Design a binder for this molecule. Structure first.
Ligand SMILES: CNc1cc(Nc2cccn(-c3ccc(C#N)cc3)c2=O)nn2c(C(=O)NC3CC3)cnc12
Length: 251
């Protein structure tokens, strides 16, 4: 990854929070986003650098760009500013008015980005609607949506059990104690089908953990065109999950 000097960046409005981060709009001497890591232990900073490294070594139409990292107790990932923000937020605002054909384009674009990652034997590890950014809305007639899958933030391996429980239903059950992205992908399809209302999201940490410990399965989507696909992706057996080559073909 590229090293960014603090003199080259300007920090503007707070956009929201990530895991152990604060996301701000900014300027790079370009409009960008600044992912400000909380004061952290070296294991966390390392997991943050590993993400910036992974995202700086990849290039795909549906993957967000990483400009670099600015490093005292402050670690800032300088990443792509995407026009319309998170998919989950947009789906809730547009609830009941999002056509099936629009959802199918998003699913295909997401499967495309994940197939590219799969071919290179790389793991994203944080696939959810929140990390899917809308570059184009595709609301006007003769237009379609355009997504950018955001960087996964602090790597999954560096997070606490409490943080992994907070990631349910997107977290693969084998991660509770490349196949994990197939589950993340399936849970994201359900979330898209239910207009940004993910299953179990409202439930308590104890309830979410019990759901996985008791091996319960996630609901079927309201969209029948994705029922088989989500059932195949959301199996507790990682080896039984289809490849993104198969998913992309089946879409
Ligand atoms: C216009 N452009 C952008 C806006 C934006 N906003 C938010 C960031 C974080 C949380 N929330 C949020 C959710 C829910 C609530 C509530 N309630 C409040 C804030 C956002 O809205 N994030 N973002 C990124 C990006 O990489 N963000 C990382 C998440 C991946 C890139 N461009 C943009």
């Amino acid at each position: 990854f590229h090293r960014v000097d603090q003199k080259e960046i300007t920090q503007l409005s707070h956009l929201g929070q990530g895991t152990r981060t604060n996301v701000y709009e900014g300027r790079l001497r370009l409009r960008v986003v600044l992912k400000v890591l909380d004061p952290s232990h070296h294991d966390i900073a390392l997991a943050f650098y590993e993400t910036a490294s992974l995202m700086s070594q990849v290039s795909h139409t549906h993957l967000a760009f990483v400009h670099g990292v600015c490093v005292g107790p402050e670690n800032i990932m300088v990443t792509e500013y995407v026009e319309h923000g998170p998919l989950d937020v947009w789906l809730r605002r547009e609830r009941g008015h999002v056509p099936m054909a629009w959802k199918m384009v998003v699913a295909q674009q997401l499967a495309s980005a994940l197939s590219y990652l799969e071919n290179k034997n790389l793991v994203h590890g944080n696939v959810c609607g929140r990390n899917i950014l809308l570059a184009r809305l595709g609301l006007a007639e003769g237009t379609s949506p355009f997504i950018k899958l955001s960087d996964p933030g602090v790597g999954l391996g560096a997070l606490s059990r409490e943080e992994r429980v907070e990631r349910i239903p997107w977290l693969a059950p084998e991660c509770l104690p490349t196949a994990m992205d197939k589950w993340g992908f399936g849970a994201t399809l359900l979330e898209i089908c239910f207009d940004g209302e993910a299953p179990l999201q409202s439930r308590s940490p104890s309830e979410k953990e019990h759901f996985y410990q008791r091996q319960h399965r996630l609901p079927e989507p309201s969209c029948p065109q994705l029922a088989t696909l989500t059932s195949q992706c959301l199996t507790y057996e990682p080896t039984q999950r289809p490849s993104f080559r198969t998913i992309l073909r089946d879409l």
